[PDB]
């Protein structure tokens, strides 16, 4: 179909060729900004940014991408608007679609963003839901490509360790499906994503020359990895009781120097969508470090996080370039 | 001019003539935007948006309107600044007035917005107070004209059912005073607006060929109505302790299909300033529904809300074009 | 020397000459805006505004200053982002430095803004920390220059009364160190600023033709004052419990007409960084009045605050012109 006037709710709504085009557009916009040759395509466009959860990267990416492109934005945060508590999403979508050219939504159930897209009458982009986080994967893939230039995604081995059933796990399944990556989801069975989704995506991944492996075996799982990726063990919005349960299950899947060693690959790089709990320099991070005896980092150690192998800030930067591409592609021709 | 640097705090501060001019400006600005011939008149202008209460429509109307007109905005929400608690309104006014070209204020007592207007030295616009919501009526009036083209306001019958002593009830009175509408406030005597304002506003409406009827009788009260309007029974900022007494006094005044049929006009349309509790798709909407046994809708039924007679979203869109007229008229020329 | 691509974290990181240049740029920018001859130098720049505390003057100064100069801003308030609770400052700094051209930070410990500066890779400006509030002094100095034309700072006597160990007391010390002001901190001993800073700053102030006097004696400290300055007795972030002890200790240092009279100078002017508790018009201002028997105001009486001698709003206005100078001086040649 293409991107013009299309929503961006999850990756599987696009073809491998579409995903690839988006990535090339992101790379091009990245270079034009860096060279002072950026051509504003969204001048005069007004964009609404709905956030029902906290955000630094996604919030800032949409803001900077919009401003660079000549657009203006309205940030509607977790509090201060009628959204959710006093007004239905169907109503919110119908009001915003009459005033804005595009709408970003970060929140809970994927069904909320789906309903918004159905009733907005303008492009709606998923800035993170409980089930999927498509723009993140766009940033991740562009980063991997830049770090293994002249290496097709189907020549790459990517390991995602930890909670494989959160939005990132699901998104990992989608990206392999459209790229042919050799995806390894290294986690305990209790944190494995939906079998039906794994089946669908593995078939598609193989079709593109890759595979999808779900294993509890760290050694076998990370062998030959080009990239090890992780994320917090309890996501935004989950009840705090999930920490005890999750840490008991996932502490052995922490990304630390031993795991980096187990890949047998001196060039392996480390990725993390962020925010990360890698030291005691955050309120909640210090809380959990003491409550669960995790000193030196949780899902990843500060050692790996700050090591030469870590490319999380290149990854974070790309969040803005890929989000700019999504808005340019869906709002201009 | 005539509007130049004039505050917009309530409708009785204007004449029928001024009202028509703003409505005409709004209509022109609406067509210019849609046709793409919008000429920015507020380039370089900086506007402060003080919000002591939640907002989706008003917040977005001021932002989009300002952006379309080349102005910039600073959103000062319920949290984050010194307003209310740490600093007097008088002080806040004199500070903002030294930095901004205009100030929108949404909050509590009308005296706050009057004090702000007193000391700001720049135009102040009321984006809702406990007593009045003038920008909403501009949108409503424009919407009605568009839906009964060619008809003058004294040729239209408008019914407002429910809590007639909230900000909307007072603003309906004001609107009738300046248009000569045949206004019917259908509500229990306990929710009737202040007699003094009714009397003042009735004399003026009649001068304009209209009238103001306050009746507890629904059947006779809605006969011949061109429009049926309603709003939530407990307004933002009112003690939650008021819901029981309100629901009991007002549930009989719910805008449902029986009320619509009672007008005897097949062309009757439904208006609601929004947000509306018309189903179980909102947090407090679902809670109050099950708490008082009101499913399928509260002040309005989902059935009427979603019917072909409902024009609430044309009405919501008009919030932006009319707020734009207000800023353009008072800041420009 | 210069400001180009330098941080602005505290005054002592600059020379008397650099400060003077900044103040002159502020006066120019102020005059240019007023004459409608302002030339935007930050067109296309994107700035992140981190606020961990509330703000009206600083928030709006940064927004208006940026808009006037063609830059855009992303307000990251006390809630809605990952800052501090979910993500460390090093991480935040490295993420924002990849997307923005400049970062403003208002919060707590000075070490937070220093780390931010160390890791951002872009200029970061201190919009207030527990220890320093440099942009405020720029506004104060410009207002003093403007109100005592053709009198060098070292020909002026400045009195700061009250809690002299908060960010404002420390900043007064720095300001006197760079200008040669005859500064008097009229405050009880328990509230005198740290010894080492007093010593370092007095030598520099003297080098510049001024002095720094700490005294518990009001009459002696305010004699011959050209300006009397004060601030709230309990600062943002400090425990509410401090009010009890602070009022008992500082009540004697309230700025009232008697203190103005004790200067022996008919032309003495009054300054206050704001917010100010000078009447009951505040939430936590009405109470503390009745609760602690403080009538007429707290750190300052309403009589003094509203008197002809008060120039607090010229001072507040200058917060914007000086913050504009800071961003222009650091982001452009
Ligand atoms: N599983 C996590 C994923 C967080 C992604 N956060 P990210 N890279 O989009 N930055 S943020 O600053 O915009 O939050 C969760 O749901 O909590
Ligand atoms: N009586 C109600 C009126 C709400 C008007 N809300 P409205 N049309 O201005 N949209 S909002 O999204 O900006 O709140 C009350 O005071 O709660
Ligand atoms: N010592 C005080 C100083 C407050 C400065 N506040 P100011 N002139 O920057 N306005 S504000 O509206 O931006 O807060 C304290 O730390 O609480």
Tab-separated table of C-alpha atoms in Angstrom, chain A:
chain	number	residue	atom	x	y	z
A	1	UNK	CA	0.000	0.000	0.000
A	2	UNK	CA	2.680	2.454	1.019
A	3	UNK	CA	2.920	5.092	3.735
A	4	UNK	CA	1.087	8.186	2.549
A	5	UNK	CA	-1.791	8.792	4.944
A	6	UNK	CA	-1.332	5.445	6.549
A	7	UNK	CA	-1.291	4.684	10.290
A	8	UNK	CA	1.805	3.142	11.925
A	9	UNK	CA	0.467	0.757	14.585
A	10	UNK	CA	2.759	-2.270	14.406
A	11	UNK	CA	5.395	-3.562	12.004
A	12	UNK	CA	3.491	-6.492	10.495
A	13	UNK	CA	1.124	-3.985	8.875
A	14	UNK	CA	3.926	-3.413	6.357
A	15	UNK	CA	5.965	-5.409	3.852
A	16	UNK	CA	9.713	-6.052	4.040
A	17	UNK	CA	10.070	-3.664	1.103
A	18	UNK	CA	8.060	-0.978	2.907
A	19	UNK	CA	10.108	-1.361	6.085
A	20	UNK	CA	13.250	-1.092	4.054
A	21	UNK	CA	12.042	2.093	2.373
A	22	UNK	CA	11.221	3.663	5.723
A	23	UNK	CA	14.756	2.827	6.931
A	24	UNK	CA	16.375	4.367	3.838
A	25	UNK	CA	14.246	7.491	4.324
A	26	UNK	CA	15.368	7.650	7.970
A	27	UNK	CA	19.043	7.358	6.909
A	28	UNK	CA	18.533	10.080	4.363
A	29	UNK	CA	16.809	12.465	6.776
A	30	UNK	CA	19.564	11.760	9.333
A	31	UNK	CA	22.252	12.772	6.835
A	32	UNK	CA	20.438	15.887	5.581
A	33	UNK	CA	20.064	17.218	9.132
A	34	UNK	CA	23.715	16.565	9.868
A	35	UNK	CA	24.737	18.357	6.641
A	36	UNK	CA	22.350	21.306	6.932
A	37	UNK	CA	20.531	20.136	3.839
A	38	UNK	CA	17.272	19.137	5.560
A	39	UNK	CA	14.182	20.002	3.519
A	40	UNK	CA	11.133	20.691	5.695
A	41	UNK	CA	8.169	18.702	4.362
A	42	UNK	CA	5.765	19.206	7.252
A	43	UNK	CA	5.562	23.009	7.332
A	44	UNK	CA	2.247	24.149	8.752
A	45	UNK	CA	1.303	20.690	9.981
A	46	UNK	CA	-0.067	20.401	13.546
A	47	UNK	CA	0.520	17.183	15.461
A	48	UNK	CA	-1.078	15.961	18.699
A	49	UNK	CA	1.102	13.911	21.058
A	50	UNK	CA	-0.955	11.765	23.439
A	51	UNK	CA	1.052	10.231	26.295
A	52	UNK	CA	-0.721	8.038	28.864
A	53	UNK	CA	2.688	6.783	30.089
A	54	UNK	CA	5.984	8.545	30.840
A	55	UNK	CA	8.481	9.337	28.135
A	56	UNK	CA	11.812	10.984	27.360
A	57	UNK	CA	13.023	9.432	24.037
A	58	UNK	CA	9.714	9.004	22.265
A	59	UNK	CA	8.396	12.408	23.456
A	60	UNK	CA	11.568	14.251	22.424
A	61	UNK	CA	11.897	12.343	19.109
A	62	UNK	CA	8.424	13.402	17.991
A	63	UNK	CA	9.040	16.946	19.145
A	64	UNK	CA	12.445	17.405	17.513
A	65	UNK	CA	11.447	15.502	14.346
A	66	UNK	CA	8.353	17.709	14.042
A	67	UNK	CA	10.193	20.997	14.601
A	68	UNK	CA	12.996	20.125	12.148
A	69	UNK	CA	10.282	19.426	9.553
A	70	UNK	CA	8.409	22.728	10.081
A	71	UNK	CA	5.546	21.231	12.126
A	72	UNK	CA	4.160	22.164	15.553
A	73	UNK	CA	3.052	19.769	18.325
A	74	UNK	CA	0.698	19.690	21.309
A	75	UNK	CA	1.827	17.451	24.158
A	76	UNK	CA	-1.099	15.913	26.092
A	77	UNK	CA	0.549	14.101	29.013
A	78	UNK	CA	-0.658	11.488	31.572
A	79	UNK	CA	-2.537	14.324	33.345
A	80	UNK	CA	-4.124	17.642	32.363
A	81	UNK	CA	-6.470	16.505	29.572
A	82	UNK	CA	-9.829	14.605	29.608
A	83	UNK	CA	-8.287	11.544	27.868
A	84	UNK	CA	-9.290	8.171	29.343
A	85	UNK	CA	-10.659	9.245	32.704
A	86	UNK	CA	-13.354	11.634	31.522
A	87	UNK	CA	-13.601	10.990	27.790
A	88	UNK	CA	-13.697	7.842	25.652
A	89	UNK	CA	-10.966	7.169	23.136
A	90	UNK	CA	-13.607	7.161	20.334
A	91	UNK	CA	-14.588	10.692	21.333
A	92	UNK	CA	-10.975	11.853	21.752
A	93	UNK	CA	-10.143	10.519	18.278
A	94	UNK	CA	-13.063	12.321	16.673
A	95	UNK	CA	-12.187	15.660	18.342
A	96	UNK	CA	-8.445	15.523	17.605
A	97	UNK	CA	-8.945	14.411	13.990
A	98	UNK	CA	-10.886	17.674	13.386
A	99	UNK	CA	-7.960	19.827	14.582
A	100	UNK	CA	-4.697	17.937	13.871
A	101	UNK	CA	-2.956	16.450	10.834
A	102	UNK	CA	-1.503	13.498	12.722
A	103	UNK	CA	-1.713	11.915	16.160
A	104	UNK	CA	0.921	10.068	18.196
A	105	UNK	CA	-0.320	7.736	20.925
A	106	UNK	CA	1.608	6.087	23.728
A	107	UNK	CA	-0.433	4.078	26.175
A	108	UNK	CA	-1.857	0.801	27.291
A	109	UNK	CA	-3.768	-1.768	25.245
A	110	UNK	CA	-3.068	-1.998	21.509
A	111	UNK	CA	-6.850	-1.955	21.135
A	112	UNK	CA	-6.904	1.679	22.398
A	113	UNK	CA	-4.503	2.843	19.638
A	114	UNK	CA	-6.413	0.709	17.076
A	115	UNK	CA	-9.714	2.390	17.995
A	116	UNK	CA	-8.054	5.810	17.850
A	117	UNK	CA	-6.758	5.035	14.302
A	118	UNK	CA	-10.194	3.826	13.251
A	119	UNK	CA	-11.914	7.035	14.361
A	120	UNK	CA	-9.317	9.814	13.949
A	121	UNK	CA	-9.542	10.288	10.155
A	122	UNK	CA	-5.835	11.305	10.158
A	123	UNK	CA	-2.648	9.166	10.496
A	124	UNK	CA	-2.131	7.716	13.975
A	125	UNK	CA	1.267	6.436	15.140
A	126	UNK	CA	1.868	3.927	17.923
A	127	UNK	CA	4.469	5.462	20.260
A	128	UNK	CA	4.316	2.344	22.520
A	129	UNK	CA	1.452	0.141	23.762
A	130	UNK	CA	1.525	-2.845	26.107
A	131	UNK	CA	1.843	-5.192	23.097
A	132	UNK	CA	3.960	-3.364	20.499
A	133	UNK	CA	6.592	-0.627	20.123
A	134	UNK	CA	7.183	-0.324	16.327
A	135	UNK	CA	9.167	2.931	16.171
A	136	UNK	CA	11.729	1.487	18.582
A	137	UNK	CA	12.528	-1.402	16.208
A	138	UNK	CA	12.933	1.050	13.332
A	139	UNK	CA	15.637	2.781	15.414
A	140	UNK	CA	17.208	-0.547	16.389
A	141	UNK	CA	17.432	-1.860	12.819
A	142	UNK	CA	18.959	1.367	11.477
A	143	UNK	CA	21.516	1.236	14.295
A	144	UNK	CA	22.435	-2.442	13.605
A	145	UNK	CA	22.782	-1.624	9.888
A	146	UNK	CA	25.057	1.291	10.652
A	147	UNK	CA	27.139	-0.937	12.959
A	148	UNK	CA	27.490	-3.814	10.487
A	149	UNK	CA	27.666	-1.900	7.214
A	150	UNK	CA	27.346	-4.125	4.188
A	151	UNK	CA	25.754	-6.983	6.035
A	152	UNK	CA	22.159	-7.861	5.324
A	153	UNK	CA	19.834	-8.315	8.282
A	154	UNK	CA	19.683	-12.000	7.323
A	155	UNK	CA	23.434	-12.164	7.965
A	156	UNK	CA	22.904	-10.861	11.497
A	157	UNK	CA	22.241	-12.701	14.740
A	158	UNK	CA	20.295	-10.713	17.317
A	159	UNK	CA	19.710	-11.808	20.857
A	160	UNK	CA	17.013	-10.240	23.043
A	161	UNK	CA	17.409	-11.449	26.631
A	162	UNK	CA	15.009	-11.036	29.550
A	163	UNK	CA	11.243	-10.485	29.485
A	164	UNK	CA	10.440	-11.819	25.961
A	165	UNK	CA	6.705	-11.360	26.374
A	166	UNK	CA	6.620	-7.547	26.832
A	167	UNK	CA	6.103	-5.079	23.938
A	168	UNK	CA	9.747	-5.381	22.869
A	169	UNK	CA	9.655	-9.183	22.714
A	170	UNK	CA	6.574	-9.036	20.460
A	171	UNK	CA	8.227	-6.317	18.406
A	172	UNK	CA	11.345	-8.457	18.074
A	173	UNK	CA	9.176	-11.203	16.553
A	174	UNK	CA	7.773	-8.723	14.033
A	175	UNK	CA	11.117	-7.257	12.960
A	176	UNK	CA	12.721	-10.710	12.352
A	177	UNK	CA	9.605	-11.614	10.339
A	178	UNK	CA	10.173	-8.677	7.981
A	179	UNK	CA	13.969	-8.766	7.899
A	180	UNK	CA	15.167	-12.362	8.046
A	181	UNK	CA	17.322	-11.705	11.080
A	182	UNK	CA	18.476	-14.744	13.003
A	183	UNK	CA	16.568	-13.833	16.185
A	184	UNK	CA	17.297	-15.504	19.493
A	185	UNK	CA	14.800	-14.877	22.299
A	186	UNK	CA	16.754	-16.032	25.365
A	187	UNK	CA	14.408	-16.262	28.343
A	188	UNK	CA	12.651	-18.604	30.763
A	189	UNK	CA	9.493	-20.217	29.297
A	190	UNK	CA	7.260	-18.147	31.627
A	191	UNK	CA	8.337	-15.019	29.749
A	192	UNK	CA	7.989	-16.405	26.216
A	193	UNK	CA	5.712	-14.448	23.864
A	194	UNK	CA	2.492	-15.901	22.386
A	195	UNK	CA	3.101	-19.185	20.478
A	196	UNK	CA	0.672	-18.195	17.744
A	197	UNK	CA	2.639	-14.991	17.109
A	198	UNK	CA	5.983	-16.823	17.280
A	199	UNK	CA	4.743	-19.392	14.730
A	200	UNK	CA	3.514	-16.731	12.297
A	201	UNK	CA	6.671	-14.628	12.561
A	202	UNK	CA	9.127	-17.535	12.385
A	203	UNK	CA	7.627	-18.712	9.089
A	204	UNK	CA	7.950	-15.173	7.696
A	205	UNK	CA	11.473	-14.775	9.092
A	206	UNK	CA	12.584	-18.037	7.425
A	207	UNK	CA	10.977	-16.903	4.187
A	208	UNK	CA	13.381	-13.961	4.366
A	209	UNK	CA	16.410	-16.090	5.241
A	210	UNK	CA	16.436	-15.936	9.012
A	211	UNK	CA	14.933	-17.772	11.908
A	212	UNK	CA	13.358	-17.378	15.299
A	213	UNK	CA	14.681	-19.372	18.231
A	214	UNK	CA	13.127	-19.270	21.698
A	215	UNK	CA	15.367	-20.796	24.369
A	216	UNK	CA	16.023	-20.843	28.078
A	217	UNK	CA	19.661	-21.737	27.333
A	218	UNK	CA	21.859	-18.634	27.541
A	219	UNK	CA	25.042	-20.292	26.285
A	220	UNK	CA	23.348	-21.875	23.271
A	221	UNK	CA	21.078	-18.887	22.791
A	222	UNK	CA	23.759	-16.204	22.589
A	223	UNK	CA	26.367	-18.186	20.640
A	224	UNK	CA	27.530	-16.217	17.580
A	225	UNK	CA	25.469	-13.119	18.443
A	226	UNK	CA	26.312	-9.859	16.626
A	227	UNK	CA	24.100	-7.936	19.089
A	228	UNK	CA	22.754	-8.668	22.578
A	229	UNK	CA	19.654	-6.601	23.431
A	230	UNK	CA	17.767	-6.312	26.687
A	231	UNK	CA	15.144	-4.213	28.476
A	232	UNK	CA	13.645	-3.774	31.982
A	233	UNK	CA	12.132	-6.884	33.541
A	234	UNK	CA	8.914	-5.090	34.545
A	235	UNK	CA	7.470	-2.588	32.057
A	236	UNK	CA	5.722	0.768	32.600
A	237	UNK	CA	2.179	0.198	33.828
A	238	UNK	CA	2.677	-3.310	35.258
A	239	UNK	CA	1.823	-3.742	38.927
A	240	UNK	CA	4.818	-3.435	41.199
A	241	UNK	CA	4.294	-7.009	42.453
A	242	UNK	CA	5.697	-8.133	39.103
A	243	UNK	CA	9.216	-7.245	40.232
A	244	UNK	CA	9.601	-10.045	42.778
A	245	UNK	CA	8.098	-12.573	40.360
A	246	UNK	CA	10.109	-11.276	37.357
A	247	UNK	CA	13.488	-10.901	39.099
A	248	UNK	CA	13.294	-14.412	40.505
A	249	UNK	CA	12.668	-15.569	36.942
A	250	UNK	CA	15.022	-13.269	35.081
A	251	UNK	CA	18.039	-12.486	37.211
A	252	UNK	CA	19.887	-15.388	35.638
A	253	UNK	CA	19.237	-13.765	32.250
A	254	UNK	CA	21.019	-10.542	33.130
A	255	UNK	CA	23.216	-9.119	30.384
A	256	UNK	CA	26.706	-9.010	31.962
A	257	UNK	CA	30.322	-9.652	30.867
A	258	UNK	CA	29.850	-13.417	31.101
A	259	UNK	CA	27.011	-13.360	28.549
A	260	UNK	CA	28.980	-11.047	26.280
A	261	UNK	CA	31.790	-13.630	26.593
A	262	UNK	CA	29.456	-16.520	25.725
A	263	UNK	CA	28.740	-15.121	22.262
A	264	UNK	CA	32.319	-15.994	21.299
A	265	UNK	CA	32.225	-12.751	19.333
A	266	UNK	CA	34.730	-9.966	20.167
A	267	UNK	CA	32.739	-7.527	18.025
A	268	UNK	CA	29.360	-8.096	19.692
A	269	UNK	CA	27.571	-4.870	20.502
A	270	UNK	CA	25.088	-4.157	23.280
A	271	UNK	CA	21.634	-2.617	22.709
A	272	UNK	CA	18.957	-1.451	25.151
A	273	UNK	CA	15.803	0.492	24.275
A	274	UNK	CA	16.166	2.484	27.552
A	275	UNK	CA	15.461	3.687	30.136
A	276	UNK	CA	17.772	1.091	31.751
A	277	UNK	CA	18.352	0.105	35.401
A	278	UNK	CA	22.149	-0.390	35.228
A	279	UNK	CA	23.290	1.217	38.515
A	280	UNK	CA	21.850	2.875	41.610
A	281	UNK	CA	21.509	6.339	40.096
A	282	UNK	CA	17.702	6.331	39.842
A	283	UNK	CA	15.150	6.191	42.663
A	284	UNK	CA	13.525	2.933	41.557
A	285	UNK	CA	16.832	1.392	40.472
A	286	UNK	CA	18.372	1.852	43.938
A	287	UNK	CA	15.152	0.612	45.548
A	288	UNK	CA	15.247	-2.679	43.594
A	289	UNK	CA	19.051	-3.050	43.879
A	290	UNK	CA	18.641	-3.243	47.672
A	291	UNK	CA	15.307	-5.083	47.759
A	292	UNK	CA	16.647	-7.853	45.564
A	293	UNK	CA	20.409	-7.836	46.071
A	294	UNK	CA	21.183	-6.685	42.533
A	295	UNK	CA	24.238	-4.479	42.856
A	296	UNK	CA	26.012	-3.364	39.696
A	297	UNK	CA	22.883	-3.279	37.524
A	298	UNK	CA	19.677	-5.215	36.964
A	299	UNK	CA	18.746	-6.395	33.415
A	300	UNK	CA	22.272	-5.269	32.399
A	301	UNK	CA	25.377	-4.433	34.434
A	302	UNK	CA	26.823	-0.915	34.509
A	303	UNK	CA	30.024	-2.605	33.315
A	304	UNK	CA	28.483	-3.800	30.032
A	305	UNK	CA	26.260	-0.700	29.796
A	306	UNK	CA	29.255	1.625	29.917
A	307	UNK	CA	31.655	-0.691	28.011
A	308	UNK	CA	33.007	-0.079	24.498
A	309	UNK	CA	30.513	-2.669	23.182
A	310	UNK	CA	27.564	-0.510	24.260
A	311	UNK	CA	25.892	1.459	21.463
A	312	UNK	CA	22.661	2.441	23.292
A	313	UNK	CA	23.139	6.149	22.726
A	314	UNK	CA	23.527	5.719	18.971
A	315	UNK	CA	20.355	3.633	19.200
A	316	UNK	CA	18.611	6.348	21.238
A	317	UNK	CA	19.604	9.045	18.748
A	318	UNK	CA	18.125	6.993	15.911
A	319	UNK	CA	14.777	7.065	17.684
A	320	UNK	CA	14.420	10.626	16.405
A	321	UNK	CA	15.573	10.001	12.843
A	322	UNK	CA	13.231	7.036	12.344
A	323	UNK	CA	10.274	8.829	13.955
A	324	UNK	CA	10.907	11.750	11.589
A	325	UNK	CA	10.757	9.278	8.665
A	326	UNK	CA	7.424	7.861	9.844
A	327	UNK	CA	5.866	11.353	10.025
A	328	UNK	CA	7.333	12.498	6.721
A	329	UNK	CA	6.301	9.284	4.933
A	330	UNK	CA	2.743	9.281	6.250
A	331	UNK	CA	2.076	13.033	6.063
A	332	UNK	CA	3.792	14.092	2.819
A	333	UNK	CA	4.398	12.888	-0.758
